[PDB]
Structure 1
């Protein structure tokens, strides 16, 4: 039985990806608008992970629709690794026009789909559709959007043969309706609860940045949550310690966490250089069925196809929880079966002593 860092046992659900402390537990996420993966690339990634997600635009150009990119790679990976878990990606907030499901959410087609247009946040200072570079915003407060969006993701998961969904964005643009923020948080939870049911019984629900308080209504139905570390405030010593508390809490709920590092928030040289530091940041808080993601972005070219040697080194089960070297300091150590981790999250230095 895998052991959380408090000594409690972690009991996974039947449909969770495989987990092991043999080496660093890995999660990969990638996509390429311009091409599908070569077989060699599928083998490279399949050898290093049991758990991955295909990105928002993958294979859109060669195949016309991003969900066919997901469909193609899910089947390629499962031919190699039948037990592999592949998530379909869908944004809960931005109506990225990359899938066929979202093909109407463009400036020059949305008016021709009034029902879908009514699902979108209107900018009050324009009475016009709010947008970010003409990409429209789903309105989680709109119950029909919650029904349609959740059915749509479930449709994307089924059409792609993916093992679940990576849901991006939990905020429901609360800052655009700050008076309704609490309602937005509750609506997010309802939309996730719908999707979780509509997906059927053996499907993984991963929510991006779902450790955050704004996702507390979303969190319970989630199987997994990702720590995106999308900027440098999230890599502060305070945030890293909060990550570690969150990771324990997630594991005690029997859920999965993805500790993702993009070194763009600190390039292949810099990443391989910094890999010892950011791995150690993960290993301090690592829990059963938590996974490390590493690179410098979310494209196929963003790290998934590089060798960071530390990730492939023998790790072994933790010998215990981490130790805060001094009760108010920012040095942290943790012992694993085959490695000794040391990290100072104030100065940003680390040493993993592989044994």
Structure 2
């Protein structure tokens, strides 16, 4: 146990700028924001106790501070006051031009025409010859090289201005379904944009891509340091998808990269805190079956500060310890999986949705 071991027994060698990792208890990642307010010191303390790795969300502190990147700057400093080594990521979406940061302030129905260069970065709906939009939120066009340059510089500027340790990039699809004949170009362009960002952030900055395990992100994945399994709907929590997760988590770890295995019980088949606490054992088990060095669990029922980050799920605080080996698929075509850790025995049936972790 001198070095962290992937489930294939190979050694995981982290980069110097990675967050802390340990198997002592479930390795945790947190991600949260609140448009309406900053964290109270007591809330910073609560989260800081439970994680070394978090991300501030897309709108945090927008109302009190006026711009979401100042929310990120505020919390990054608050957390680092407590744990100077905490890793705090700045959020930026690669697809939706959410107008929550100063950087994106022009991407509104009433301002965009006054910014013709920024407007030219956006997808046009061929059905209207006007900007494509989702409730008047416009769509970056990754096929536009000037957008790739602007966006990657902007994100790097947001990481620098906020004092964050890197970036969480949301979305990898580049709206490929809107230009499906160019899907391969979109995937290639996305990789180009991420490589620009990775370079522009300079050394020692973490790049986490959301859902970057998906084939659509293959050109982006190499320059990423981390990828998140978002489990954003029921299909992604199927027994087949969970087995794919576990396969992907090994591949990610073998690449020296980190994974975030994120669960929002809003996507559970079944009052969210009660449900979340009841399902914690099952979803933790799903993570532990596939867990690797420098993989982290995120748990709650959404993305707001009030969506789980400030609740105690006692399973997450129990001693876990290093895995004693890879999971065992109890029968070759069945959906029961077990795995042993130094302080816990995991059993899960992903066909039926039942699990039991026996804490020793």
| TM band (smaller chain) | over 0.9
**Cα shift at 1:177:** 0.1
**Cα shift at 1:241:** 0.2
Q: Deviations over 1:272-310 (max 9, x none)?
A: 000000000000000000000000000000000000000
Rounded to whole Å, the distance in 2 between the matches of 1:296 and 1:15 is: 29
Cα root mean square deviation, aligned: 0.7
Rounded to whole Å, the distance in 2 between the matches of 1:233 and 1:68 is: 36
**Cα shift at 1:239:** 0.0
Rounded to whole Å, the distance in 1 between the matches of 2:19 and 2:88 is: 9
Rounded to whole Å, the distance in 2 between the matches of 1:191 and 1:197 is: 10
Q: Deviations over 1:179-234 (max 9, x none)?
A: 00000000000000000000000000000000000000000000000000000000
Rounded to whole Å, the distance in 1 between the matches of 2:37 and 2:203 is: 32
Rounded to whole Å, the distance in 1 between the matches of 2:149 and 2:130 is: 23
**Cα shift at 1:29:** 0.1
- Could you say what secondary structure the match of 1:193 adopts? helix
Matched residue pairs, number? 355
Rounded to whole Å, the distance in 1 between the matches of 2:308 and 2:110 is: 36
Rounded to whole Å, the distance in 2 between the matches of 1:140 and 1:58 is: 25
Q: 334, 339, 342: which one pairs with 1:334?
A: 339
Name the counterpart of 1:53: 55
- Could you say what secondary structure the match of 1:101 adopts? helix
Q: Deviations over 1:83-110 (max 9, x none)?
A: 1000000000000000000000000000
**Cα shift at 1:148:** 0.1
Rounded to whole Å, the distance in 2 between the matches of 1:248 and 1:121 is: 36
**Cα shift at 1:79:** 0.2
Rounded to whole Å, the distance in 1 between the matches of 2:67 and 2:111 is: 16
Rounded to whole Å, the distance in 1 between the matches of 2:287 and 2:195 is: 29
- Could you say what secondary structure the match of 2:103 adopts? coil
Rounded to whole Å, the distance in 2 between the matches of 1:17 and 1:315 is: 19
**Cα shift at 1:130:** 0.1
Rounded to whole Å, the distance in 1 between the matches of 2:133 and 2:21 is: 40
Structure 1 segments (4+ residues) deviating >3 Å: none
Rounded to whole Å, the distance in 1 between the matches of 2:344 and 2:161 is: 42
Q: Deviations over 1:120-171 (max 9, x none)?
A: 0000000000000000000000000000000000000000000000000000
TM-score by length of 2: 0.98
Rounded to whole Å, the distance in 2 between the matches of 1:143 and 1:96 is: 20
**Cα shift at 1:270:** 0.1
**Cα shift at 1:58:** 0.1
Pair 1:346-2:351 in alignment: yes
**Cα shift at 1:313:** 0.1
- Could you say what secondary structure the match of 1:17 adopts? coil
Rounded to whole Å, the distance in 2 between the matches of 1:67 and 1:296 is: 24
Rounded to whole Å, the distance in 1 between the matches of 2:25 and 2:339 is: 15
Q: Deviations over 1:316-343 (max 9, x none)?
A: 0000000000000000000000000000
- Could you say what secondary structure the match of 2:74 adopts? helix
Q: Deviations over 1:217-272 (max 9, x none)?
A: 00000000000000000000000000000000000000000000000009100000
Rounded to whole Å, the distance in 1 between the matches of 2:353 and 2:97 is: 37
Q: Which consecutive residues of structure 1, in runs of 5 or more, have no partner in the other structure?
A: none
Rounded to whole Å, the distance in 2 between the matches of 1:66 and 1:267 is: 26
Name the counterpart of 1:314: 319
- Could you say what secondary structure the match of 2:107 adopts? coil
